[PDB]
Amino acid sequence: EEKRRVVYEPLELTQAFRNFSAGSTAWEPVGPGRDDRPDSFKLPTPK
Amino acid sequence: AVEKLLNVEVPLRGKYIRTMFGEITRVLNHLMSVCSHAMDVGALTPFLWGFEEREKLMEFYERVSGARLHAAYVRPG
Amino acid sequence: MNSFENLAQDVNITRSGKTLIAKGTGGRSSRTGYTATVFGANGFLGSYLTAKLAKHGTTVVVPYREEMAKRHLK
Amino acid sequence: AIIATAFAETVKFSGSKQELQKRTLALYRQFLRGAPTFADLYEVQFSIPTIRTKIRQEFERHRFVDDLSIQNVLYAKGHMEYQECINFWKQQAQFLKYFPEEDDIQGRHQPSNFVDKFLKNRA
Amino acid sequence: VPAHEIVSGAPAELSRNRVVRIYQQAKPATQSGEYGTFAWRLDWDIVDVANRWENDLIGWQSSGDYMQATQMKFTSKESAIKFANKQGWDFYIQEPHHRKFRVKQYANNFVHSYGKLKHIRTK
Amino acid sequence: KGYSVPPGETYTAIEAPKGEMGVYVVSDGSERPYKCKIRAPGFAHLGAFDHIARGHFLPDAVAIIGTMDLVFGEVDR
Amino acid sequence: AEIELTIDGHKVSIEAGSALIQACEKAGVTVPRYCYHDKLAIAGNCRMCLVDVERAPKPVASCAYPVAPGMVVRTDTERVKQARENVMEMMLQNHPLDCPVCDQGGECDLQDQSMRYGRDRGRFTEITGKRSTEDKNIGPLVKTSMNRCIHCTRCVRFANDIAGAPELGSSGRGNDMQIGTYLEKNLNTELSGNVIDLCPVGALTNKPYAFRARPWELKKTESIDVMDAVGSNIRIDSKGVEVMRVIPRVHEDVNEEWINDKSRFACDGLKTQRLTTPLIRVGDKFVNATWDDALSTIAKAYQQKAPKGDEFKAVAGALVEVESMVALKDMTNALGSENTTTDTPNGNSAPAHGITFRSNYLFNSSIAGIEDADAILLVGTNPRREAAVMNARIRKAWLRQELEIASVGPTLDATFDVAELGNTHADLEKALSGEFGEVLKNAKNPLIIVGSGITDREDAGAFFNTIGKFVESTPSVLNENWNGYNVLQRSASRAGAYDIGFTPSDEASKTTPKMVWLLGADEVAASDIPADAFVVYQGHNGDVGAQFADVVLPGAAYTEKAGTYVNTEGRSQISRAATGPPGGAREDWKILRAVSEYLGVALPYEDAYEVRDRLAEISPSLVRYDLVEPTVFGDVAVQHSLVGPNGSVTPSSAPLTETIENFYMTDSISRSSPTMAKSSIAFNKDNKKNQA
Amino acid sequence: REIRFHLCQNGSSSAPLRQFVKNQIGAFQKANPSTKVLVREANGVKPIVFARFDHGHESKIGLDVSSEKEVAERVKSLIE
Amino acid sequence: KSIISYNGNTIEIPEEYTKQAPNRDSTWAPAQASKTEIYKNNMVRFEQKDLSKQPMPYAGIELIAQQPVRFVHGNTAVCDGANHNGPGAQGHPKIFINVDAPGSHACQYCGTRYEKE
Amino acid sequence: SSYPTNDIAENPYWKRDHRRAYPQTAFFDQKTVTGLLELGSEATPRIADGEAGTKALANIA
Amino acid sequence: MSQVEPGWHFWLGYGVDTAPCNTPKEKLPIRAYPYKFQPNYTGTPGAFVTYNTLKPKISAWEPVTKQR
Amino acid sequence: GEHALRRYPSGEERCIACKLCEAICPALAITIDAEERIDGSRRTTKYDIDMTKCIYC
Amino acid sequence: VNPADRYLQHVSDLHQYAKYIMAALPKYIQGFSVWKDELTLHVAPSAVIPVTTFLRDNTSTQYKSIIDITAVDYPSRENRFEVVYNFLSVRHNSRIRLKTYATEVTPVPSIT
């Protein structure tokens, strides 16, 4: 009100941000999975 | 994009239903766009006729989802 | 960061006996603890006074005379 | 975007320190000529030499920087700030970001020693 | 080591007043999974006055500290140290603690006790 | 918690009525996206404004806004 | 000595005779399981870790199938995936629909492994339906809701093996098996709040943190536990101004995954009777006050009393930070008075053993070293109460090996088996000469534990004379590669206080103080402080010690501050601050640093790093966090602690008493909590706790 | 008043101080009965003596010298 | 009636608004914050305001105690919480209560007490 | 629901999950393409003497 | 618009065919308390005020002195 | 539209404090504290919605 | 049926195409990755401008339209940001990705 302009101030919240990423899974949720590589473009096994 | 990452296949009815609501969304988009352009140039009547047809379509969104303008209907699954 | 410029300290006690722990850093979303009544706060001096007073979070009590001026204090 | 903005410069990275010194020299000249334009343009309360000493002080901040690459990013940011200030795209509320302490004394009880910082536990 | 704290746009007070911590997350005692215990987290130690305080109005947890929610994940310990002193931060590093390998047999459960039994298993 | 997505990266583009709209999402393997990015169709259209709108009059700088369909939820976000 | 095999194509080498699940854990292969645990016995109940093994007709349980050479293990067989879906569906058909009301929502082992390995849908839809299990009131600390039990025996295996409380068991056949005491008998042990982190489903859960919060909301913070001898590792979960629970993170040396009862459930008293503002006594009434009011009242009362020297007593207490003791010791010694004592009875003098030579007052064998022991004896202590995790160590090593115990002091009810020797220093010296000179001289790795309760005895130096003569005379108990004289210290501050030199001189014990400073220091009696003296109590919550004060000053407790703590072993460890001090409390060294400025003392530090530099000036083993060093001075220290009380103290015939009266209420936080208050009455000798 | 000192336990130029400890603690206790010593050990610290006098005034000295008599001369100079 | 507003000043509210609800006088949680503490904490903004048009919605701990206790002949008492006029799945998930101990065991979703007879 | 998925007894879920059967990014260096140009392919292997073929692979590796 | 009753509000907006006079007693919800109907009191002094439903998170010490 | 906490037949609060509405809310409008009440039943002490940051999903 | 099964023939065609593209500019292409009908060329920053011109100018490629270009930071890498370019040949109905790297201060050259 004093300066009759907007002022830019350091941050302060009326409710703090609560992330809920703390509390994700502790089991590895997906496997390795298969491959789409064709038989032409992977290295040959010897013999 | 998430379906492509997740490697899942959506059912058949779920495909035809997002084809259809992807096209009344297209009708609503071109309706808003053409009529807002015609107002920006100066025609006043297509603005209101088109927004009437938009109200007739927002009734369908209100049936399908809950809210009219913002619908979380199409999900990654 | 912001700071309570008006206060000498954190914990202030009134003369009446009430104990006032100021919370947090300075600024808008913090609270100093004081309750203040500014009469005539729509006036010329009072607008600057309750600008400076509610800047740090002292609870300002505004007795108003007309409903249309006081909007500029909210 | 065929043609560029008026006071633009294609960003270009110099491998020698003396060319960067010449460019920051030219850039201080460009800020310093444009300070009456800034004082007229943003309708500020104070005098032109305070803008000029702000410009000097903001170059006094980054004098003993060694790394040429960091001097290069610092030059490019400074020329972008000049291009925003001279074209009047920044407004007076963001122009006066640069002057936070001049506009008003924030209040009594500035904590300097350990005791005045302790009584308000740093506020 | 290059110093990138002046070109990230972070304030000076974050680099000079705040100490940070690199840590590997402990294996939880509740559940037996170990998946969140590989990436090195970066997290800031709290400020005494600025952390959290109860709102007068409702009881909302209001904060003045803004880095309290940010937390980083790194692949290796060296990458976290390199990034942390590259951004100019004071860090403490906490070494992880693994379990000691002890050989288990099921046939341990019922070995012949020549003297006093001094235990009753139950299964 | 949510479901978890296999680790990967995709750019999936469909045709909005505004034009081609896509999304580039980088999946950590966690249940939060490591990175998302929309490609707004109107972003490239408003970015192509001064290539087209040179030499036109001032009324014709407005009927060209209506064709590139700037809704501005797209362009900045 | 090792065996090389193949899991998932991976080739792995592991010590011979181990379980197959340890080979899968070594190779990085994730195997799901419900009744296996690192610190517990092997059982094959839950049938979850089935695995495809070449040269085996059926899928064998990976937790109890021993490692053999030439072994080819596959875990991604279609048969193994089918087996895990099968066993998972079998687990879920009598397990009740309690996930919105269960306390293990984001923490349930059954639940996260049902996504990853179990079936999508459920075929359980009978009209008759699931079974129902009667609720079983165990005790006040453990809420018990046994419909959602899966019978993994893990609680039973633990309370049998390590806790030494055989009251748990399994009574029945078929679905009508239950897991509880058969008679509805109350379960005591000194660590009964550890079975509720152990159960993988939420059948045994926390009673004061019954339904308060929820793990995706909680912010975890890795700190150190005060109100324990060993200084165990914890994990503080905070909503952000409140503190919810502490829960043990693993360290194989200090606690080995298992944590005290009193350490765990004292989060209740962290937030119930706290000091949030300074209070000045008017006379029969406190008033609360301004900071400048309280600290200038301290300065004015110093200028009024004027203690010129040896009259400013500054006694610390049970839980304090090392850095606050740096602050206090620096303030008193720049004041000009080393009347700088500790809280315990007979704390006014040097504690009958050297501040010199750190191996005098520390647990000199490692805490990891008690596993290697052959025949050990304790004097004047009850390790079941004090350092209850050390009791788990002693019983565990006694169970695995051939260990021999006797005890000198009160007749203790151990979990393990002691022999009795007596209640007298004469009974001590007779037992050292008669039987156990031969036993401790015969044994390879013996040790001797000394309680700090007999350090607080006035006849202390007779005991230290006899034991120092025995340790110096016997070359087996003290040699190069390990050290065998050991002591326990009750409080977390006493080892740090003896590192820093926080002890009075012989001159300082003679005078009566005019101004007393209580930093913590709750167990002071009314008679210990003079009636004319101007006492001031700096501490985090109200107590006995706050009631005697003329000024109280709120401080940050161990959650609210980052602090160095030194245990009985000698580890320096830092606590991370979880939350901030509520109301107007400040950190403990900053208050003393500011009270110095109103006196004539400018303390040379003023920031948190300069405290660390001053702390390295006191001893650089306190900036060297969580390392243990040996002692080359083990031979010299026993002699130098022998010479002092030789003939100076005569051994009186007073019997050796118990050190603590109750377990549960012994410091400022535990006496404030209602959880310990209704715990100590319910864990008093009743018919529900008598074994009968 | 009190005197305190610090050595590294490893044999890295702290052996002469260490031998001075093992031979002369008992003599220094009799030389100064009111003074309390404290000896500490951490494997990285250079050998150093802090002596603290009245009213919180202390003085230090570094002990990179390889003779017990020289170490006693340093300690005797720093008591003064 | 007269409660002290941190200054020795008595503030006076009617007795029908100090109750937690018109079912129940007292508090049903250890942190329920009784109404006198609420009007003590922020009376600055109950100024010039009607207390009657505040909600005050019928505390539920008393409306469940007056419901009768169901009696089950068998061992296990099974519970929905559902209506059976409603076309769909309403109510809570089905849980099965053991009624063996003396007394009446409550549903943890609905609070309806079941007793074996 | 559809029939091979609402089926009470014939399907197991691991046969019909495809979230866990995702394929991987085929990341190819420059040196593995030299391997594919000189060793060969699994469709057409140009490798004889497999015990020496591993050593022939190893220098490219 | 806030002065119309809840079951009737859904009918005036064409949600239900049958008015709440003509619905059966099966679709009448069972209650154990009386009904009040406050419409809306914005600007009126009977406007809603919000407050803390629970007490402050960390308690302070009520002081008692001691004669030593 | 606006929000409502329903009740059971014969008057019981229905909110068993499972925090699932809080964990899913995309704009973090919900805040709940929960305590075990006198009956031993799990109920919310404090339930709260900010309608200025609710997005009606 | 697995929705990844419908891609497999085109994913093999995409492999052979990318092996050709690497054999054509060996000085400038460090790697490639084919996920599932998604091709990504892996290129140095001083190699941005010579590859892009090729993707515009060769008749077999003709990646005329720029689609979207952006960055992703991995703070664990020494070169923190990676910069991705998406192209679309509207002739051949094909998409392509081009990934390079850049630290906070060192550049990547512009294709504008």
Ligand SMILES: NC(=O)C1=CN([C@@H]2O[C@H](COP(=O)(O)OP(=O)(O)OC[C@H]3O[C@@H](n4cnc5c(N)ncnc54)[C@H](OP(=O)(O)O)[C@@H]3O)[C@@H](O)[C@H]2O)C=CC1
């Ligand atoms: N040159 C100056 O300005 C000087 C002023 N002062 C004094 O400072 C004070 C405020 O100065 P200033 O800001 O300039 O003038 P103001 O406009 O503030 O004076 C009027 C203020 O008081 C209120 N007011 C006037 N009469 C009544 C009444 N019967 N009941 C309730 N409120 C009333 C007004 O209400 P509303 O807002 O609705 O109009 C207004 O807020 C005054 O006391 C003045 O005497 C001191 C010396 C010189």
Ligand code: SF4
């Ligand atoms: S323990 Fe069982 S009932 Fe509780 S949340 Fe986990 S799966 Fe559900």
Ligand code: SF4
């Ligand atoms: S009581 Fe708990 S730990 Fe024991 S067997 Fe049952 S579920 Fe497992």
Ligand code: SF4
């Ligand atoms: S807390 Fe929320 S999600 Fe849980 S039962 Fe109550 S209203 Fe529903």
Ligand code: FES
């Ligand atoms: S854990 Fe191996 S079967 Fe239970």
Ligand SMILES: [Zn+2]
């Ligand atoms: Zn029910």
